[PDB]
From a paper:
The causative agent, severe acute respiratory syndrome coronavirus 2 (SARS-CoV-2), uses its Spike protein (S) to recognize receptors on host cells, an initial step for viral infection. Key to this virus–host interaction is the binding between the S receptor-binding domain (RBD) and the host receptor angiotensin-converting enzyme 2 (ACE2). Therefore, the RBD has been a primary target for neutralizing antibodies that prevent ACE2 binding by either direct competition or steric hindrance. Here we report the rapid selection of synthetic antibodies (sybodies)24 in vitro using RBD as the bait.
Crystals of SR4- and MR17-RBD diffracted to 2.15 and 2.77 Å resolution, respectively, and allowed structure determination. Of note, SR4 binds to RBD sideways, as intended by the design of the Concave sybody library. All three complementarity determining regions (CDRs) contributed to the binding through hydrophobic interactions and H-bonding that involves both side chains and main chains. In addition, Tyr37, a framework residue, also participated in binding by forming an H-bond with the RBD Gly447 backbone. In addition, owing to their minute sizes, SR4 and MR17 could be docked into the “close”-S with minor clashes against the Asn343-linked glycans from the anticlockwise neighboring RBD. On the contrary, the N343A mutant was more resistant to SR4 than the wild type, suggesting possible involvement of the glycans in SR4 binding in the context of the S trimer. As previously reported for other RBD-targeting antibodies, SR4 and MR17 showed tighter binding with the trimeric S than with the monomeric RBD, likely reflecting the different oligomerization states between S and RBD.
Residue numbers in the entry:
A (entry chain B): 334 to 527
B (entry chain A): 1 to 119
Amino acid sequence: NLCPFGEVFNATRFASVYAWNRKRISNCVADYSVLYNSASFSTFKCYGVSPTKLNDLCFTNVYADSFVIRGDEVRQIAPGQTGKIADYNYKLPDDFTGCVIAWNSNNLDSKVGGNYNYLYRLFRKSNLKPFERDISTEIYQAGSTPCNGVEGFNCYFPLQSYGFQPTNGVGYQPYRVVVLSFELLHAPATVCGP
Amino acid sequence: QVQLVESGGGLVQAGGSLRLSCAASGFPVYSWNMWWYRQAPGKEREWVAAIESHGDSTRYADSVKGRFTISRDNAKNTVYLQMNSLKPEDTAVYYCYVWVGHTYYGQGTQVTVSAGRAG
Ligand SMILES: *[C@@H]1O[C@H](CO)[C@@H](O)[C@H](O)[C@H]1NC(C)=O
């Protein structure tokens, strides 16, 4: 009764980072060692837990969050990070228990002339809390004058497009990211290794 | 409402220069990422350069690095592509792209680079 991690890692399309997706993993058996040992994952960094011990543990729920950012931003998907992505799009807590997995997806997510489907949030009144998700498109008030819902002077639509294009340098190429978080509750632990 | 109107292309000799113009209407150019592409007959569209929204950070394809420069004239609501040291293989139609909810495209402007003697 295997955990359906394939639906996460092998999805055709990933979400924009500002609208990141989450899959709840429960009541199943998962072989984390198979993922951790795959060379196709160039980032596979765990926090508060050892990747090689994951097959020895049970959790009540496992959460798999997935999205696309560009290469230079993968470093922001870590505890303690700041920047547009960490501050405004996807935020890990200081005391994160889980793993960050990423791989270059230029062959999947770029297109000649640009793939404009993947967006990022550039402005926000405050930083996201850990695991908070903000998909609003209210006009951002950059200055002293209220915006009243209309773009204008110091009044910005909050999102931009990556426009991923295949000859971008690697720091501007798309990377698919999967964040696994391991949750232990009073409820029974239903997600175990082999 | 929104549109991108290009100008400044034309015929120029190898080693010379041109300044392409991408004039926007319906949004401020400083608020949005902009990309420049080019296409030569029988070849695919080729990314050339880009400038980020709300800032001055730029990037360039290896083929034009050091010779092409993006800049903005916010008073004119215009983004320029300065092209120096032109080579014949720079000949192509050049386009500017801007995403504003969806992608808008300039109409393109022809750049033709010549080499040799007129006599
Ligand atoms: C994804 O697809 C590859 C190839 O079809 C397969 O080997 C792999 O087990 C699948 N699942 C995951 C989680 O990578």
